[PDB]
Ligand binder design. Sequence first.
Ligand SMILES: Fc1ccc(-c2ccn[nH]2)nc1
Ligand SMILES: Fc1ccc(-c2ccn[nH]2)nc1
Ligand SMILES: Fc1ccc(-c2ccn[nH]2)nc1
Ligand SMILES: Fc1ccc(-c2ccn[nH]2)nc1
Ligand SMILES: Fc1ccc(-c2ccn[nH]2)nc1
Ligand SMILES: Fc1ccc(-c2ccn[nH]2)nc1
Lengths: 265, 264
Amino acid sequence: GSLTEDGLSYKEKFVVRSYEVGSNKTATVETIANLLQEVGCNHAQSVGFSATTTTMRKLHLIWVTARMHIEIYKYPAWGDVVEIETWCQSEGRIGTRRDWILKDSVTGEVTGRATSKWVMMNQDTRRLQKVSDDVRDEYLVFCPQEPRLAFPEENNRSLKKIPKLEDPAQYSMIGLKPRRADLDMNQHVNNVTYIGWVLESIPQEIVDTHELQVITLDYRRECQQDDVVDSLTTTTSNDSQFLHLLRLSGDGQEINRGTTLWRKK
Amino acid sequence: GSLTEDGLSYKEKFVVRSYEVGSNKTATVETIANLLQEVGCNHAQSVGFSATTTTMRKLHLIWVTARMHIEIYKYPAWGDVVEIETWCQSEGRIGTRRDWILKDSVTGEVTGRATSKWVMMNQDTRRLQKVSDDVRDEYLVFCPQEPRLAFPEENNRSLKKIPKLEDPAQYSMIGLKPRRADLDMNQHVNNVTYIGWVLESIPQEIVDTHELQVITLDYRRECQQDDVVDSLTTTTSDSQFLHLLRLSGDGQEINRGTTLWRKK
Ligand SMILES: Fc1ccc(-c2ccn[nH]2)nc1
Ligand SMILES: Fc1ccc(-c2ccn[nH]2)nc1
Ligand SMILES: Fc1ccc(-c2ccn[nH]2)nc1
Ligand SMILES: Fc1ccc(-c2ccn[nH]2)nc1
Ligand SMILES: Fc1ccc(-c2ccn[nH]2)nc1
Ligand SMILES: Fc1ccc(-c2ccn[nH]2)nc1
């Protein structure tokens, strides 16, 4: 992996592993999400972050994901080489955006794209803050100054407000709990695990006869390593669409909402 | 990744990823088991295999793991490059063995090793069956002829019989269920998932104060996509543990194991 010529983006090649594929012998959207996270981490390391600054670490401030949007046109095959380019851009005091483009190394064709909104939060209190100038100014030398959008379309499917699924749900998967392998190095549930829990309530028949094209996930609250999750899905629709909700099995506190678009194989 | 000069073993390098590390910012034993699995599939691929022969495929016969034995001396750091060498060997009609050696790619020091026993099974009936001479000659030109052992020591840790934990267990984690990310390309629960379920009944303070040195796991029966698992652990002491996985309902055995932990 390396910063591009201009130092304002990062590129990395991945060979798809045997255990990274599903029934199609192609990469799951969870392997894709993990590769996005790895290249994002390598980009931050490459310019001397860890993705907080010294100002942020001093104030116990972190970046957390508010929205993930992924679009896949073709899932890579086991042993295929995929190339991912990633960069960040300020969206003012609200937060920052990380975008990705996925390419077939052999053809150079775009096979997917992703974008993500991040907000600043106090580690301890869990309270959001707007981004100070001094923090804004720290990152600005690592980001393009002209807009560079994975989803340029002034109004695109990555920017809808997602509605709250109403009881009763059409489909559900009850009593989901994280195991150690779902935790990151700070013992929080990995952002990708929530993607997996959302998809657990899609019926096997959809998964057997459709491919996931688009997923948008909002992150409201985190599942604590000793919480239990219920996953709820309702059909909203040759294209199939679904509304998704994750909530704590007990009190019914919302942790995520989302939408998926599937096309027939 | 490439077969070695003599065509009788396979080598592959891996850069340890951000999401592959635990709270020590080193590779989990599950990330290590995944890497063993990946180099193993690449070795089978490099010499023409499915790791079944066209004869086996016609008979609806597969290889299934009876036993996994892993010993780690140092877990690789995030960003570190680890080199894994792997090879197979007949143990006659009973089954075959796959061995691995893990090296630090910078120092060339051995940081771990693993061995596994594999038995032939009819995919449909799930009946064991011993290995025929036709299905043996096919594999023997891909395997060293002189014995080559990751664990050479005549009657060593990897060859003990594992006893059945007795209720009540000291510790338990119940209601464990696989998700799609736990399945392989044939929609079976991945061999590595069971290692994760065994370790789920180890208390957090052990995991926080010890590093895992040795794990031996026997594979008795599959967890189906819609089965529920209970994980049971009892201290048998360095700290040592006996392990049992069983179906939450009828309490049918799917695995047994032991783990050895060193104080950090
Ligand atoms: F689905 C995703 C994709 C990327 C990430 C990410 C990038 C840096 N840290 N985490 N998280 C979830
Ligand atoms: F706004 C952002 C975008 C990316 C990241 C990130 C986390 C780990 N690598 N990169 N953090 C905040
Ligand atoms: F909010 C963020 C987080 C990370 C980055 C970043 C990492 C490497 N280059 N730029 N930029 C903004
Ligand atoms: F711990 C494990 C589990 C599975 C495997 C394996 C090798 C080839 N297929 N599966 N290797 C090590
Ligand atoms: F005895 C063996 C040894 C290796 C394997 C195997 C399966 C997938 N890759 N390698 N199977 C049985
Ligand atoms: F039972 C087995 C399974 C796989 C192999 C193998 C794969 C590559 N070389 N040898 N040998 C014996």
